[model samples]
Target: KMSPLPTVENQFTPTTAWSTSVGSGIGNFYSNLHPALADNVVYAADRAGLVKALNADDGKEIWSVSLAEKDGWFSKEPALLSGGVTVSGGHVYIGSEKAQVYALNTSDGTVAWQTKVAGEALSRPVVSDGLVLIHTSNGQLQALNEADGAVKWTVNLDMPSLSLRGESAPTTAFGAAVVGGDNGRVSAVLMEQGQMIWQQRISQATGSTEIDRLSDVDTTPVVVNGVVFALAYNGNLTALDLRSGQIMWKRELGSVNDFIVDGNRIYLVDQNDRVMALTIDGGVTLWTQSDLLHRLLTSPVLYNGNLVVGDSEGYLHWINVEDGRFVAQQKVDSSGFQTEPVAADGKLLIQAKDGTVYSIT
Candidate 1:
């Protein structure tokens, strides 16, 4: 049995620290493309290819560049940028729906290297061990040298005939690359030499209908303390050993969004728009909040002892980590959010679908 959904009228309110715009924002057809933060700067990009670096404290733009065109030409059209921004090692990494991966200098928006990928690069590029690993929509994971835009290795997988419109971002840690596939598989690859260590099936096709049988691991795997936590659409939340790819535990919780692992607990937003907290060791349910049911909530993020999540209505809801009670909420953007909010250095950064970036302290 579940509790009744809470009403929105009595939700707590949050204070506005600062708000700024990246561009006019994208329509409903594209992805949200979450922002990245590093070195007291927030790196954000709009679907039109407007990439900007803003000061983390004051929301002031440090630099902006438009990757819409190679050169000024009437025939050139704007690029439909998706995925998200990644800042690392003095470089900003991002991908586009045009099947491209770009490395830009962090100081200036100058292009360091640009390379063509096999398919639409719709996930955040994972930079680790001097290599940039990206997963494409066409069921391929490619590794490129961080110094130059040269392909080192590429691994291809068989994708389902019908699936969702997103791909799981690769997570590199413990000298291995862990990623999820649309075919309900999670694999671990050696980072030094793109070799497969192990692969495990997180979920399998069941149901008689196509929609019921959809099982895609579109959420990014969260690796913490030698364990990998991943979720799948219409599938289960699985916990695997990071070193051996062994399934430690799994729970029947369906979700398409990524989850957060902090200390001994894992926080997540399920497909039915419920926020839940579970113990990391044995997957014991701690608390569940169903107030935002059917609201299309993003992944849950931990910020200053509060579990935060955004919804399709552009509201950020904060819940007490221990009790799962609403603490604060704010309407950051009316256009709604498609990406999860990020936290760094005692501040929260959220990017709405309308390209509005808000920083809350």
Candidate 2:
């Protein structure tokens, strides 16, 4: 799906700290499962439900487990893991297309608890205040007990007749969970009692066709300094006040991928695959890089002071964080990428669609 290669002044090759694999990878499946790092260990999984924990320093497989259950005498049913891996409070949490959430102990790949959610959890689980949150496709935001798998509280949103295949994980700030809605609204739910604080529609659906009217807020809500940044697939990039849910500013740019909010700027890959930098205070589009348009880019990731995005051809494009210039282009894998690059400290983790995980520094 990528066009021709874009040349850089120096097509540098990124140094690999370590690399490993998990099952056959997402393997042509439609998923956004990326690796997550915590406590010096990288937790990764594939679409077939193989979760592995590796030492961040050397990619040593500390533990591995198969969530795939037996399907027949000599086969197993894929867990259909898509929500991605997350580690918090000594547990690695993942959700499945089977409408289940599995909490594995980070110490050993043991199941702490498994709870069924309201629908398919296509987003990463968000952890806040001793609760793990999952936003399912059925417009359900479930808060589960961190220590156990008890369903503490459930919040529901109005779903559209047709939405995208994914959902944004709920984020938290100002004593509430900020969730993007299938109906193009962002809501702030009280963390203590799951009460709705305020719900604001960022954009309304338009056009006659379902493709044109699809305005799902699949991008995770990013809250910073009391302001919330959210995006919809066919809507707008909006900034909302955390407490009052007022629109501070709204940009006409729409994106499906997760964005980076670092310091005074926000980096996003729009629906057209255009990478851009916008000023956080105002909706000013500072710069745009169109070289990667239609390259099927992954979400923009901040690594080594540059924004990195993987393409369908497994090439990682490094763009200048300041001016949106092409800093470098490096190929990390050949199987292509679907998930966002996971970064911690100076270590960046990339997972190919074939399920190979690479550690770049």
Candidate 3:
């Protein structure tokens, strides 16, 4: 159910430092192909496996490569790269829909290594210790040596009977991989030897209909000050102890996208498009702006001194954090945004559905 765009009075103008394009964008597909930043370089890709690296400041192309496969001499098959870009240990890692992952050298964009994994990696790879980790759709957490694409270990879990078409990217904190599951649970895997430390059921599914019983924790869990905050599609936002997996608190707010934890508050967009702010100490509802209801918003990012997000209508909004009021607005891409803008080194890199990348300072 799409909601009518609420009228907003703009107060200030946002500056666009630079803009450019990669390959053709996602084009209305359910993808996580957002841009990633590392070492003043921006890495982005399209569904057809076109990856690009650009200078973050001026948007100059450093290198570009295509991962599409050639069919004899006349045609090529799309690689269907699904995950976003990731840089770790001086190598660029990305996953494809064909249950494969590739690592490329950051210096020359040459293929460092590539290998097939257990399932479709729907999230970006995370570097843990000397290993590269990925979460797949078939309930497998596959780990590999960062130097070569050799499998190191794997952790498996059972998925729900009915889940959404998305996954929670593995987040490494301390010495473990904290992950969310479609079964409305969050678990911690010891990265050293592929062992499960603990698993906490965030919520139990309920109802006669499988749709109503959907309890997937697709949101990537956020960890701050030894607490792991996880959100489920039908469950409450639950904070648990990172070491023990014990519950800290639970708030009845449902969401599908990831959240931001800045300072002492957590910023999230609910399923109904309500942008909310909750206190980190008690999970108390601080304030919520419901004017953007049903507009399909990317998760909020704390930029400068305001909370910023993009909408389905290609509008980027900046709101005051204290009162949740619009302070500034801008429209950059009509095809709209698929993910939150990547903020790094005092600037933002926003990728629109039309393949244009806008850098805002």
Q: lDDT scores for all predictions? A: 0.78, 0.82, 0.80
lDDT of 2 by residue, 113-162 (tens): 99999898888888997999999877888999998889999888776555
TM-score of 2: 0.94
- Stretches > 4 Å off in candidate 3: 1-11, 205-218
Q: Estimate candidate 1's RMSD in Å.
A: 3.2
TM-score of each model, in listed order = 0.90, 0.94, 0.93
Total backbone clashes of candidate 2, pairs 3 or more residues apart or in separate chains = 2
In model 1, the Cα lDDT at residue 13 comes to: 51
Q: Model 1 over residues 1-361: C-alpha lDDT tens digits? A: 3233344454445676887798866657557488899999889998888899988888888999988876465544667787778888989998888989999899988999999988888888889878999888777889999999799999865564444654478887778888886667788888876888888877773222355422333557878888888875454788898877889988876553556788999887766777888899888899987888777677778887888888878777888888888877677778988776888878798888888888875
Per-candidate clashes, comma-separated: 0, 2, 0
Candidate 1 versus the native: TM-score? Answer: 0.90
Lowest lDDT sum, 10 consecutive residues, model 1, at 206-215
